[PDB]
Design an enzyme around this catalytic site. Structure first.
Site, mmCIF file in Angstrom:
data_model
loop_
_atom_site.group_PDB
_atom_site.id
_atom_site.type_symbol
_atom_site.label_atom_id
_atom_site.label_comp_id
_atom_site.label_asym_id
_atom_site.label_seq_id
_atom_site.Cartn_x
_atom_site.Cartn_y
_atom_site.Cartn_z
ATOM 1 N N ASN A 198 -2.098 -0.464 -0.137
ATOM 2 C CA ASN A 198 -2.233 0.976 -0.300
ATOM 3 C C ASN A 198 -1.775 1.823 0.888
ATOM 4 O OD1 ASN A 198 -4.180 3.570 -0.247
ATOM 5 N ND2 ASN A 198 -3.608 3.093 -2.331
ATOM 6 N N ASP A 229 0.524 2.012 -4.175
ATOM 7 C CA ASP A 229 0.352 0.581 -3.877
ATOM 8 C C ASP A 229 1.707 -0.141 -3.889
ATOM 9 O OD1 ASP A 229 -2.396 1.071 -3.799
ATOM 10 O OD2 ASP A 229 -2.871 -0.228 -5.521
ATOM 11 N N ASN A 247 -0.937 6.397 -7.344
ATOM 12 C CA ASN A 247 -2.355 6.573 -7.556
ATOM 13 C C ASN A 247 -2.693 8.062 -7.520
ATOM 14 O OD1 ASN A 247 -2.336 3.947 -5.214
ATOM 15 N ND2 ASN A 247 -2.697 3.604 -7.387
ATOM 16 N N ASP A 258 -4.602 9.885 -5.830
ATOM 17 C CA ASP A 258 -4.849 10.518 -4.550
ATOM 18 C C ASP A 258 -3.572 10.745 -3.775
ATOM 19 O OD1 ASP A 258 -4.271 7.943 -3.663
ATOM 20 O OD2 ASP A 258 -6.051 7.789 -2.363
ATOM 21 N N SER A 318 -1.495 8.512 -2.942
ATOM 22 C CA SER A 318 -1.113 7.224 -2.374
ATOM 23 C C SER A 318 -0.312 6.400 -3.393
ATOM 24 C CB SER A 318 -2.316 6.391 -1.922
ATOM 25 O OG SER A 318 -3.138 5.946 -3.005
ATOM 26 N N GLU A 359 -2.569 -8.613 -8.974
ATOM 27 C CA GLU A 359 -2.123 -7.343 -8.380
ATOM 28 C C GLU A 359 -0.720 -6.939 -8.833
ATOM 29 O OE1 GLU A 359 -3.672 -5.079 -6.905
ATOM 30 O OE2 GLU A 359 -5.465 -6.092 -6.015
#
Lengths: 114, 129
Positions: free
Chosen positions: B59, B52, B46, B48, B50, B35
């Site tokens: 998220n 991480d 990301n 959308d 969002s 990760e």
């Protein structure tokens, strides 16, 4: 994709109805789900959720969720859509897009009492 | 902060992740590797809206608040900044919630893609634990 059934429902005042949604995706999980109603004659759908006459069931293992409405009246007529919520820890673009999908709708007609 | 593998294993064991929700310690070390490459300050934006955050790339649509993510929940009830710390407590406590949310460690794409079905015990080989 989210498969919502039935497409159309006619019921008498006093009866109950149930609407089902199944998420057709082998990868993404079903965490919870939501329901919306568009009144007859309008474009705008507003939330419906668990409580009182509204009874929600989520089956994560089958990736399905259902809304039951008891003690129907004419005021319950309208178009209902489901929307799944599919959570993940780190970002997954497939499952992210599922969270924006709605069922195809169910057009509910409740006939007046006599 | 970038963790050493064994350093991170030690920290995760102290935080109670060995066999948490059935996942032996090497699962968690391996998840962190793929990760974040053990970087506590890792962030990735990301499509959308969002982001991480942190060593386990948690998220912001679901788990924390970054004040800029559309349609977001804050299920771990934390600011996303808390997940970028040199101390891993926040990320671990949120990881514990995520792994208990109904999908196991399949909640992390990197675990699914790079740890599941592999010899994850290798990730603690050589570690004083």
């Amino acid at each position: 994709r989210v498969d919502q059934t039935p497409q159309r429902i006619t019921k008498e005042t006093g009866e109950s109805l149930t609407i089902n949604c199944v998420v057709r995706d082998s990868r993404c999980v079903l965490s919870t789900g939501y329901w919306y109603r568009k009144p007859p004659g309008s474009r705008n759908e507003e939330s419906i959720s668990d409580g009182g006459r509204y009874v929600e069931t989520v089956n994560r293992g089958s990736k399905s969720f259902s809304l039951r409405i008891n003690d129907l009246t004419v005021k319950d007529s309208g178009t209902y859509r489901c929307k799944p919520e599919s959570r993940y820890g780190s970002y997954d673009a497939v499952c992210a897009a599922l969270n924006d999908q709605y069922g195809g709708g169910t057009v509910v007609t409740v006939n007046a009492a006599a | 902060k970038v963790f050493g593998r064994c350093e991170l294993a030690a920290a995760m064991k102290r935080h109670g992740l060995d066999n948490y929700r059935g996942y032996s310690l090497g699962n968690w070390v391996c998840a962190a590797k793929f990760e974040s490459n053990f970087n506590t300050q890792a962030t990735n934006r990301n499509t959308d809206g969002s982001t991480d955050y942190g060593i386990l790339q948690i998220n912001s649509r679901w788990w924390c608040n970054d004040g800029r993510t559309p349609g977001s929940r804050n299920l771990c009830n934390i600011p996303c900044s808390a997940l970028l710390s040199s101390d891993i407590t926040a990320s671990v406590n949120c990881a514990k919630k995520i792994v208990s949310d109904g999908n196991g460690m399949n909640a992390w794409v990197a675990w699914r893609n790079r740890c599941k079905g592999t010899d994850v015990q290798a990730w603690i080989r050589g570690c004083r634990l």
